[PDB]
């Protein structure tokens, strides 16, 4: 389990993807020319997970950039780390999906698809020991959502033995690009439940609320939200891209986090929450860091973990700190909040400490939780879908592409069933 | 690729065409001979081996008068003779002549030229059809063309710019007949249609531009500014772009309900000097005041189903989201219960250009809101009544029957209008 | 109060002995093969067959999804085609019904003017019985 | 829609026709030699409507001169614009119908008809885009009435797709002692109802009354009445003869004016009313023009528009004036007199402004109205006809030519029906 | 010459292997290059090291991992010259903490390869005693691969001694929620194939480091250096000219009364921090008393709550028989030390003169004498009971089971494994009761 093949689909996918790539490149001592200039052998020890070593000194991200709209290609290349990416790995179509999941999944996307699979094949066959795939995309649009889910299905067929990991961004009316997001999101979730092993549920409702309420940003921008996303992505991938015992590969992470196959939707968490302008501030202690696991205010998914129960939790601490203190605090939290952890999964909270802190903070903590509380995010999408479907609003754009009302009925049913399952284990007692 | 083909039908369509193409040329630095010392303007202009730029447009009229001015005018060198099509005798303000008697003579000729413009397209998005509801060419020839386009180009996007009749400038008593027959015949063939009420434009010129007796030159220069705001997203590469498909997806909830209301702001007389500069918030709010609307109706009394906002010039996303937030807090502005979020945004870098010696003043930023409101039903209702008054006595019907039309065709047309009216009612009923 | 030491072994790197504090309380007394390599192979290969089976089953479902993908793409082709077919026959029947009506409209309008000619010459015959059968 | 073929039949037709030709020629800058000498490109822009260019820097009226009486041929040639017409176009018999519609329509007129159609065909086939025909004639005689209606029928057969427009002059006992005029007129109206698309009802009762009452002319002459006719004809054709949006061709005018096929008889109006060779000075104001032009005193047909309702109205203003004022005044008149405009024909009043004024006036207005009040003109002809027919007076004049009493019974019936139809829409409510 | 072949499976096994072999080298004067200055001269060291033509000494050991990371350190490390490449075996992909993946999917790929080198090493032997297998209960390699290896070894080497050093899981250092599954599944498969197995409870080691060595946050380096000491104390008599547990057969005869109850409890003393003020060395009495203190045990359990069925005392260094008999006398007076009806209440005592050795720069202080008590007590049943409960909690809801079934395992195997644990638990109970007659 060495190499990971990273894929970015649509505007959101590419926006969050580029940001991850600049964040982790800094952490690993890589400048935009692909040249290593760091000063720690720890930075390069597991560099092969995300980078291919190119001719001479240089390092090249194992990333595939995808979109049906050509514009985003230039948007990336113009970015700070634009010239770090392989030119061949840019697979861009001529006309976007026009916020229609059917177009990206069946019509215009089915094209671009094969030409994309050829790039993944070239990357994959080059691997000594392929771990699997990491896709970044939104569920709101037509490319990231529709085509991204088609990619997951076509990859799954070619590589059925590999881990499929996604950073799926959830739509919110609070920050939206299309009136049809409930259709696009519902149809995507159905596909994610069946075809992924681990999905990070990055909720735009959660990020907007963090920026507006906590960060006090009157008008949050995609920059402000992506500042929280990049932080989170850096945290959840710390165990993968640096030496350590806990959840060091995609499969060992899936084994510790996924008890039931369909229940693979993680609620990411992060402390401290900072604004792109919050260039101060010197603080945070170990108990301070630890308290934020139940602070719904710190969740990248719009659900209160106190409204449900944790099936499994992964906690990653960064910066120089006493592991004794970390272990003490971690025990204190579980022993005092025993009512939010399922009694039937003993020692379901695993903790790791990376000495290397992220840029900007001297100390940080990331939380990856498989909580039953995630049903609230799916209930929200479902109600929004019902509001529209009940009246068959905008449906003609979907059916026009060849889809049936049945496919909509089936996508909703699976989502209701998914919620119904989380509820089943939420109630589940460790008694005979 | 992703090219649009503009079709300008009748006197109204050809004259607005003249305004539009004059403005596009100014906005792209193209001289009247077709020379120019982005790249997105190629969706609207073919390039020759001589390095000259030719509009992807066809001008059709059943009488030579108006097009003969184009071919002797300032831009006679811009269009190739083959794309300027004229008959000998007009449809005498009679739909039946434009559709059957006179139209049949030039139909094949026009489709031939369209087939040739489509041949030079590497990824045709669709068609932009400009016509009056009132004239015999605008009504009858357009409906005949739309029908023929559906046969030759199946489901390919077809969008209209329809001139809604005003008595102030109306030249025929039979315009309500022509309006209803064309609406009926076209309905199933158009994907989306932007109506421009002539009384609304007339009044904005009178009020905002201080024009005592507005002329077609005054009206067209204003219409041209809106049409440009709608096409800017296709002709330029801005901060956010909307394609033909994206329009239909975000503005059309049901196939029949395809008539968005256009509102442009700011409209300032080229005098004053203190009148500026208006903020993103100020110009946005203006889209919700009826004095700036392109069709005379009251949205206070109706409900919105979708809103699309096309910003141009000095516009920042943060300023736009701030402005939409304030609209989302206004009780007076009602949306339907089947619409979690009914907004779509576009942003272009280019401030609106003005024709030197024009009525409009230079502004640093402007906006055109395309909104689908149940209030547009008021415009059909006024036309339907005028039709009823005349049809009850069969006044003027003999002119139509004489050209081979059947009386039962008038009832079909009106019954379909009665159904359209009922569909606007049903859709606003919010509802179990 | 009493112990028993039994010397066991003496060697180069050490010595061993047994110490008995108390003898046993009770004195009167309180294998299954193998396994075969063929049995191991049988179990190992049974699992391989259950694994290969569930991977195949999974692959069959991804195959079902593709067959459906072609079907919706096919539906959209048949819809655009049927649209063309409605539009073609409709517009033709309307063009034929109109040509029909329009031609008939003239047929009667000339037929009324032909009656006029028939009656004009007919009037000239009534005058003939008067004009020169006269004076 | 370019060329119009103009025809003049009988004494009246030729008299009014010559007058139109001199009036419009002056407006267009054409001297009697056919040579253009004007100073505005607007004058020639639509010259082709009425004139043929023909080999030579000069212009020739597309007019056909007809009569069964030879005298009128010389009367026109001796006139000021006599030498402007094509000599070949002058088609003249030897007889003269002697105020017998039967002679004009069946006997003497049918003999000359083919020779006339000879000239129309030559003119028509020469047109790039023939609009249709314009006939000038009286309904009170035999030639203009009888032969003129035969012509319309024969031209209708050859050109069924073209517009048929007439300037039909209505008889009055005030101007003519000819007793048979009610018969001739009734027989003609029957033909006009069936075979024309647009007819201007120029009433000699109305013109006599204008000259006698308003103009204070003790004994009005055909010269005095024709002065009003020429004024009117110049006005109604302005939209046809000059560039503009409204009623620019014969068909677009018919579409805006005719709601029911048979109701195609227009009541023309003019302001200001003047006598021959009379220079005011003092041109009317815009409200003055708008009001005067809508009075019964200003109608070329002998009916009170206030006695009926307007189905449709066309209003042409000539001279330099503010279009705002024109539009304002025009709205004021139709908002204050809502009881004279049918509620069921929305926006039935269309207005046009030509910068070029007619000769003699610095400002003028012409009114073309399809009013139900026109039934008064038809009732007058009908009463006069019945007075005679009841007693079978003069019937042998027509029966002698081979006609039957039924041809008469049928002509009257259609006229009673025509009145009965105007009455139907006069009463007709919107609801 | 009666040779012993050591096998190290998975990360835990390989790393403890590194500690053990580093300590053996120090105890025998073998340098990391394999060169032993035998220049001035008991030969018993040859039961654990083959000699080459170059005069270098090579461990009779095999290191296996389904992943290269840990063994790659061995081949670049201080002792890369001690081991021959052929005896360091690695796959490319690990068993992802899944017994099934280790036993069924990935294991099958490297099994023949492993047995081949075991065969090779099994030849250079003029009187093979058997095998010493080092592995974790928790990981997918240590659980899944070991059980697969034990099975084939029974086929290829019919009735040849196989002894385990198994790492019992502690939540403090645990890396997988599924460790109780892997623990029970491996115990079940291995049971009939192992003759004797010494469990090392990670929480016990962790706590001894914290308490006695004053280590705030114990690392695998600290744990393994401790484990090694006990392992060395156990293997000493095979590697030196001893008198007690002088052959592997003896371990089994001396400690295992019944085939299934083959899990003796280890207790070591003294454990002293090297970085502390000088102290008057501990007496034979002091170190003996320490054997009956649960704070020094290798597995967390209470022998008060149990009965002994065999006891063995392994003294190292400066130890005199008179001092040992004096120490045993004192214990009997003050403490019960209940045995079973059948066994005599007593101890098999062996002294090994070779002094205890410590890794220089290590955590442990060098002592003049030490002791390791090996005792088969019914109290070890408490360790199975804790693991069995954790298994029950998860299995009731079938949590994580799909990971196992997905690798071709059957749900019935979990039932089979647990039923055998239920039987093992009952056997510890049944053995502690009165005998009849
Ligand atoms: N945290 C973020 N969410 C984003 C961003 N851009 C978009 N989005 C969100 O994603 C959804 C809209 O999607 P996109 O831009 O990704 C659509 P995409 O370009 O994949 O497909 P098309 O339909 O072909 O345009 C919606 O929930 C937006 O609100 C971003 O930069 N950051
Ligand atoms: N406004 C005018 N009415 C006229 C004129 N001449 C005649 N009339 C009127 O027309 C009718 C008499 O007709 P005409 O001279 O036209 C008869 P026409 O010559 O067509 O045929 P004949 O029967 O062969 O004489 C009658 O109402 C006269 O009163 C005229 O010059 N101007
Ligand atoms: N805004 C605008 N409206 C116009 C213009 N020209 C005409 N119209 C309006 O469009 C209608 C006139 O019909 P036209 O387009 O002129 O008729 P046509 O399409 O040429 O059809 P024909 O009867 O055969 O001449 C009325 O509602 C006019 O007021 C123009 O340049 N601008
Ligand atoms: N004492 C000690 N315990 C260890 C060591 N390494 C791992 N463990 C423990 O062993 C269990 C994990 O098993 P590992 O040996 O690491 O996993 P593995 O055999 O490689 O199997 P895989 O899942 O295929 O990687 C947990 O209880 C770890 O705490 C070690 O070096 N010393
Ligand atoms: Mg996009
Ligand atoms: Mg026109
Ligand atoms: Mg005469
Ligand atoms: Mg491992």
UniProtKB/TrEMBL annotation, chain A:
<comment type="similarity">
    <text>Belongs to the tubulin family.</text>
</comment>
<feature type="binding site">
    <location>
        <position position="226"/>
    </location>
    <ligand>
        <name>GTP</name>
    </ligand>
</feature>
<comment type="subunit">
    <text>Dimer of alpha and beta chains. A typical microtubule is a hollow water-filled tube with an outer diameter of 25 nm and an inner diameter of 15 nM. Alpha-beta heterodimers associate head-to-tail to form protofilaments running lengthwise along the microtubule wall with the beta-tubulin subunit facing the microtubule plus end conferring a structural polarity. Microtubules usually have 13 protofilaments but different protofilament numbers can be found in some organisms and specialized cells.</text>
</comment>
<feature type="binding site">
    <location>
        <position position="204"/>
    </location>
    <ligand>
        <name>GDP</name>
    </ligand>
</feature>
<dbReference type="Pfam" id="PF03953">
    <property type="entry name" value="Tubulin_C"/>
</dbReference>
<feature type="binding site">
    <location>
        <position position="12"/>
    </location>
    <ligand>
        <name>GDP</name>
    </ligand>
</feature>
<feature type="domain" description="Tubulin/FtsZ GTPase">
    <location>
        <begin position="47"/>
        <end position="244"/>
    </location>
</feature>
<dbReference type="InterPro" id="IPR036525">
    <property type="entry name" value="Tubulin/FtsZ_GTPase_sf"/>
</dbReference>
<feature type="binding site">
    <location>
        <position position="181"/>
    </location>
    <ligand>
        <name>GTP</name>
    </ligand>
</feature>
<keyword id="KW-0963">Cytoplasm</keyword>
<dbReference type="GO" id="GO:0007017">
    <property type="term" value="P:microtubule-based process"/>
</dbReference>
<feature type="binding site">
    <location>
        <position position="138"/>
    </location>
    <ligand>
        <name>GDP</name>
    </ligand>
</feature>
<dbReference type="GO" id="GO:0005525">
    <property type="term" value="F:GTP binding"/>
</dbReference>
<feature type="binding site">
    <location>
        <position position="141"/>
    </location>
    <ligand>
        <name>GDP</name>
    </ligand>
</feature>
<keyword id="KW-0342">GTP-binding</keyword>
<feature type="binding site">
    <location>
        <position position="98"/>
    </location>
    <ligand>
        <name>GTP</name>
    </ligand>
</feature>
<feature type="binding site">
    <location>
        <position position="142"/>
    </location>
    <ligand>
        <name>GDP</name>
    </ligand>
</feature>
<dbReference type="GO" id="GO:0005200">
    <property type="term" value="F:structural constituent of cytoskeleton"/>
</dbReference>
<feature type="binding site">
    <location>
        <position position="143"/>
    </location>
    <ligand>
        <name>GTP</name>
    </ligand>
</feature>
<dbReference type="InterPro" id="IPR023123">
    <property type="entry name" value="Tubulin_C"/>
</dbReference>
<comment type="function">
    <text>Tubulin is the major constituent of microtubules, a cylinder consisting of laterally associated linear protofilaments composed of alpha- and beta-tubulin heterodimers. Microtubules grow by the addition of GTP-tubulin dimers to the microtubule end, where a stabilizing cap forms. Below the cap, tubulin dimers are in GDP-bound state, owing to GTPase activity of alpha-tubulin.</text>
</comment>
<feature type="binding site">
    <location>
        <position position="175"/>
    </location>
    <ligand>
        <name>GDP</name>
    </ligand>
</feature>
UniProtKB/TrEMBL annotation, chain B:
<keyword id="KW-0963">Cytoplasm</keyword>
<feature type="domain" description="Tubulin/FtsZ GTPase">
    <location>
        <begin position="41"/>
        <end position="238"/>
    </location>
</feature>
<protein>
    <recommendedName>
        <fullName>Tubulin alpha chain</fullName>
    </recommendedName>
</protein>
<dbReference type="InterPro" id="IPR037103">
    <property type="entry name" value="Tubulin/FtsZ-like_C"/>
</dbReference>
<dbReference type="GO" id="GO:0000793">
    <property type="term" value="C:condensed chromosome"/>
</dbReference>
<dbReference type="GO" id="GO:0005525">
    <property type="term" value="F:GTP binding"/>
</dbReference>
<dbReference type="GO" id="GO:0035641">
    <property type="term" value="P:locomotory exploration behavior"/>
</dbReference>
<dbReference type="InterPro" id="IPR017975">
    <property type="entry name" value="Tubulin_CS"/>
</dbReference>
<comment type="function">
    <text>Tubulin is the major constituent of microtubules, a cylinder consisting of laterally associated linear protofilaments composed of alpha- and beta-tubulin heterodimers. Microtubules grow by the addition of GTP-tubulin dimers to the microtubule end, where a stabilizing cap forms. Below the cap, tubulin dimers are in GDP-bound state, owing to GTPase activity of alpha-tubulin.</text>
</comment>
<dbReference type="GO" id="GO:0048873">
    <property type="term" value="P:homeostasis of number of cells within a tissue"/>
</dbReference>
<dbReference type="InterPro" id="IPR023123">
    <property type="entry name" value="Tubulin_C"/>
</dbReference>
<dbReference type="GO" id="GO:0034612">
    <property type="term" value="P:response to tumor necrosis factor"/>
</dbReference>
<keyword id="KW-0106">Calcium</keyword>
<dbReference type="Pfam" id="PF00091">
    <property type="entry name" value="Tubulin"/>
</dbReference>
<feature type="binding site">
    <location>
        <position position="63"/>
    </location>
    <ligand>
        <name>Mg(2+) 1</name>
    </ligand>
</feature>
<feature type="binding site">
    <location>
        <position position="175"/>
    </location>
    <ligand>
        <name>GTP</name>
    </ligand>
</feature>
<feature type="binding site">
    <location>
        <position position="138"/>
    </location>
    <ligand>
        <name>GTP</name>
    </ligand>
</feature>
<dbReference type="GO" id="GO:0042802">
    <property type="term" value="F:identical protein binding"/>
</dbReference>
<feature type="binding site">
    <location>
        <position position="47"/>
    </location>
    <ligand>
        <name>Ca(2+)</name>
    </ligand>
</feature>
<dbReference type="GO" id="GO:0010467">
    <property type="term" value="P:gene expression"/>
</dbReference>
<dbReference type="GO" id="GO:0016787">
    <property type="term" value="F:hydrolase activity"/>
</dbReference>
<feature type="binding site">
    <location>
        <position position="137"/>
    </location>
    <ligand>
        <name>Mg(2+) 4</name>
    </ligand>
</feature>
